[PDB]
Write a protein that binds this ligand. Structure first.
Ligand code: NIO
Ligand code: NIO
Ligand code: PCR
Ligand code: PCR
Lengths: 346, 346
């Protein structure tokens, strides 16, 4: 793990310089394609991409798990939905499933701790049957967090070996916006009220309780903000841990990862805390409708491309942005050149 | 034309109601897919779509034309670029070309007034060899505007008859951000300084002159803000007129049109002024980096989906958003249902 972290590659400045010059010479006013140009340069710098913006196979990894905090009344969805939806992921009837198919991406469903019997067809990496109730203690042990990080990381890099060049990250876990808010609060130093949202349609009345739960979780566990693994283990969840693991894995592999929504921002903060070297590999997708989104994104210094007021999760936002990534590549490779048209600008 | 305007259909509220109920029953928390749901309902209301959100063939119409105002020193691009780029559109090496191919859309290049010899392969609807210099008089005659509107409108609806169900609108015309700013200024009642941008890399120094040119255009022509055709003819251009014509045509045909950037916002204001019934058919794509974008969008009451800091034009933003439209349809048609999973929410 320290090995893993040690070996994350830095971005290739040389490839990026070559990319930039190439972009500048395309059939358009310089810088006219804005963020699409910056994206292309970013990709070019990723070692697993072979010095150029390109997209081979795509995969969306969905981390599923239950949370003990559900018992605190922080979520209106029945606990069982996690298990139900996880099975549905195998049938391709879910939101991320539908959106991934549209993008030509494959969905990988991973059970990191669903509180139900095992689901056939789902990748089994179950830590336990749901994590500890963060309100009265830690979600899990540091050892448990570390091992899962390690395990997911490896699975991720392994896909790389099979042609995957672009990852998307997602989750499924009733009550998960609670640990996400706790993490955000801790990493950003924001007060709970500021970052706690309605999650999946939590009634306006029930909010106060959700805020109290987050505060309690923090007070009781005393997570250390300067220690990402400490935070994850104390006030996070298996699903959150798994997402962080994808990010660590893609970076080590020198490949890009598309973030999703709120839950993913939490995991990204953790990952960046654990290894800043991870940052350059992250790509935002959309701007989650969760209340704490703005704060979390500010701390990641990220500006999403899509404003869809989405708040479903599952990696649906990630899938939706994949075409944008492919667009930047298309632009890079298929546009003509100014010089070829004898076009001279100032 | 008055016929044309008379016959624009209202949206089908019945289809929309059915759509909404269907969306609500999908495998997700109600309203969780945000703008993707609203988009789907919007499409369902469009009569040319047959009561459901669907996408058949797609086309991006690019209106090309030169402007006399170029002579005022408002643009750094050589005048000839219009003609050059128009030809390039036939070769598929341009930005919109590359992005359309990615979206599976076909690009239609239409010459409405390029100041050069005719370009083989380009649809010929040339009004004149460039429009009048708006700084000292009108861009064209009202008759000329009306006829072009009519002609483009028809061409548009005709494509419908060949399976096209989704349009994208774009332009190509050196100096065109000048008439666009004038129109915006006039329709919104904003001062020129507020809406005049750098267009295609206009040097910061040269801005003042661009602002003076817009003011002059307005003072001299005295366009009537309550008369969209009056504005277009006086301070617009052939390309701007053509874009408005696409919007009028798609609406009459009961089909959706994706807007592009700044230039397209100008045309949209005109179209809405001319026929408010057009509004429900318009779909924003991205948020142009042009200075006057925010003001123009506010007046259209639109919030784009994509924030890419793009400012190329050509309909590139339109092409880039097409996948989003297809996503809303995919969502609508391919997701499973709550009831089927025995999922009951509050
Ligand atoms: O932004 C998200 O990903 C999200 C928001 C609410 C509930 N679940 C997921
Ligand atoms: O927003 C646009 O479409 C645009 C901005 C600048 C120059 N040309 C087009
Ligand atoms: C130089 C240039 C190229 C393309 C375009 O659409 C405008 C200007
Ligand atoms: C009810 C539900 C459905 C999907 C999902 O991802 C979350 C909750």
């Amino acid at each position: 793990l320290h090995a893993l972290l040690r070996d994350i590659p830095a971005p290739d400045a040389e490839a990026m310089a070559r990319t930039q010059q190439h972009i500048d010479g395309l059939l358009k006013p310089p810088g006219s394609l804005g963020r699409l140009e910056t994206l292309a340069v970013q990709l070019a710098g990723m070692p697993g991409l072979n010095g150029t913006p390109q997209v081979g196979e795509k995969a969306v990894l969905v981390m599923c798990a239950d949370h003990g905090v559900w018992d605190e009344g922080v979520a209106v969805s029945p606990k069982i939905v996690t298990a139900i939806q996880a099975a549905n992921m195998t049938r391709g009837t879910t939101g991320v499933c539908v959106l991934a198919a549209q993008a030509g991406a494959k969905v990988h469903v991973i059970d990191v701790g669903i509180d139900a019997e095992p689901i056939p067809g789902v990748v089994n990496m179950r830590v336990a049957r749901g994590c500890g109730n963060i309100a009265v203690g830690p979600a899990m042990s540091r050892l448990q967090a570390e091992a899962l990080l390690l395990e997911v990381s490896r699975y991720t890099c392994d896909l790389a070996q099979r042609g995957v060049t672009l990852f998307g990250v997602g989750e499924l876990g009733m009550a998960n916006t609670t640990p996400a808010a706790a993490m955000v609060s801790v990493f950003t130093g924001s007060d709970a009220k500021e970052v706690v949202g309605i999650g999946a349609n939590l009634p306006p009345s029930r909010i106060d309780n959700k805020v109290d739960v987050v505060r309690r979780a923090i007070a009781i566990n005393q997570p250390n903000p300067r220690d990402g693994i400490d935070v994850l283990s104390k006030v996070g969840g298996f699903d959150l841990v798994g997402m962080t693991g994808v990010m660590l894995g893609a970076a080590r592999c020198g490949l890009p990862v598309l973030l999703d929504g709120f839950l993913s921002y939490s995991a990204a903060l953790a990952a960046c805390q654990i290894a800043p070297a991870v940052r350059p590999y992250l790509i935002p997708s959309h701007f989650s409708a969760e209340k704490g989104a703005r704060i979390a994104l500010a701390h990641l210094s990220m500006e999403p491309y899509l404003h869809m007021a989405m708040r479903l999760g599952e990696g649906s936002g990630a899938a939706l942005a994949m075409p944008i990534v492919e667009a930047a590549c298309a632009m890079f490779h298929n546009m003509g050149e100014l010089a070829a048209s004898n076009i001279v600008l100032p």
